Amino acid sequence: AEQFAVGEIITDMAAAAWKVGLPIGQGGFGCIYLADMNSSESVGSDAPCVVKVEPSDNGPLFTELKFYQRAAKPEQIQKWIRTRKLKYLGVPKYWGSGLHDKNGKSYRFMIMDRFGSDLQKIYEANAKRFSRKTVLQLSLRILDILEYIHEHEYVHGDIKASNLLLNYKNPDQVYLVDYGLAYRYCPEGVHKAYAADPKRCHDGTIEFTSIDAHNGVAPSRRGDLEILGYCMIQWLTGHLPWEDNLKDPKYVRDSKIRYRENIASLMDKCFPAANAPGEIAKYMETVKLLDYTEKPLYENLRDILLQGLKAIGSKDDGKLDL
Numbered sequence: 001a002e003q004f005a006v007g008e009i010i011t012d013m014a015a016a017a018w019k020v021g022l023p024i025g026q027g028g029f030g031c032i033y034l035a036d037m038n039s040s041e042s043v044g045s046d047a048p049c050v051v052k053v054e055p056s057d058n059g060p061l062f063t064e065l066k067f068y069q070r071a072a073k074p075e076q077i078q079k080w081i082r083t084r085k086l087k088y089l090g091v092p093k094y095w096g097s098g099l100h101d102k103n104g105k106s107y108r109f110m111i112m113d114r115f116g117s118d119l120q121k122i123y124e125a126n127a128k129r130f131s132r133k134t135v136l137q138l139s140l141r142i143l144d145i146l147e148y149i150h151e152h153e154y155v156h157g158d159i160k161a162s163n164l165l166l167n168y169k170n171p172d173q174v175y176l177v178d179y180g181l182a183y184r185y186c187p188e189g190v191h192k193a194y195a196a197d198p199k200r201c202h203d204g205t206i207e208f209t210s211i212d213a214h215n216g217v218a219p220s221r222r223g224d225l226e227i228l229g230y231c232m233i234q235w236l237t238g239h240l241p242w243e244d245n246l247k248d249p250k251y252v253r254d255s256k257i258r259y260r261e262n263i264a265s266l267m268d269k270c271f272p273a274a275n276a277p278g279e280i281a282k283y284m285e286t287v288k289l290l291d292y293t294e295k296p297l298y299e300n301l302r303d304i305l306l307q308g309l310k311a312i313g314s315k316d317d318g319k320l321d322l
């Protein structure tokens with residue numbers, strides 16, 4: 001069922017007018033089309049926006065839209081960038097949304113920034129490795145993103161390379177996308193209790209998800225940092241220890257628990273003997289110390305990663321080296 005007539009003009013709830021172009025990408029993030037401001041011109045291949053469209057009863061797009069409306073208003077992000085002295089913040093900007101009826105069905109749409117490639121494609125093209133420099137630079141910016149969304153009451157729960165997109169015009173700026181299964185862990189400053197949430201079905205992506213998620217409890221801040229930990233190892237080494245048994249969640253959980261209890265054994269497993277990046281172990285030890293409701297010391301985690309850059313003779317110059 002086609003959701004749009006190509007070239008049609010759609011008007012959002014703020015009465016801003018947009019024009020719809022052709023589909024973009026290999027289907028990973030649902031029904032998405034290139035989009036631009038309304039004009040006499042057709043929407044081109046270099047369009048600065050995309051429009052996401054789903055049935056109005058689609059739960060994930062409603063969840064995602066609420067996240068973007070609450071936490072990703074352009075001015076709200078810019079104010080944080082200024083006050084925290086960032087070069088940029090990799091939370092996509094929300095440009096508008098509305099309702100669209102076609103063929104007796106109701107759809108919701110949302111206009112967002114258009115991005116370039118996802119990191120998973122680039123990773124695979126680099127024979128499933130990123131350099132230590134790249135991993136550290138990615139992770140510093142992901143820590144900025146996680147701090148910002150956690151301070152706005154949300155956790156992501158599904159950090160991974162396929163959910164990391166580059167700025168279309170700047171390949172040193174990485175953005176975290178896909179908030180359809182994001183979780184509001186602290187609505188109005190009240191932290192969710194250590195417990196399953198019946199409203200949440202999602203467990204994350206099995207190879208990267210947190211021990212909390214494996215235990216059936218709602219995701220919290222420590223879980224997001226743990227996920228990033230597993231991503232860093234995957235990116236550095238091409239592997240995780242539990243990757244041959246991902247059809248058995250009990251196995252995956254058991255391995256993660258054992259490797260949290262003995263982080264030195266994780267470093268021995270994942271890295272060549274005596275050749276483990278010390279910042280990765282220190283990062284994991286720091287995350288291990290977090291309680292379920294505890295606010296992370298994000299600057300301490302970034303300082304740990306910055307020691308890694310110093311150790312390889314570099315600095316945080318914002319260069320992803322992709």
Ligand SMILES: Nc1ncc(-c2cc(F)c(O)c(F)c2)cc1-c1cc(F)c(O)c(F)c1
Pocket residue numbers: 024025026027028029030032049050052092112113114115116117118165176177178179
């Ligand atoms: N804004 C975007 N721009 C380009 C792509 C894209 C995807 C591909 F899979 C691909 O191959 C490609 F070239 C481009 C995806 C998004 C996008 C961003 C989000 F934040 C989402 O939540 C989302 F669903 C989609």
Ligand SMILES: [Cl-]
Pocket residue numbers: 076
């Ligand atoms: Cl705010």
Ligand SMILES: [Cl-]
Pocket residue numbers: 238
């Ligand atoms: Cl390999």
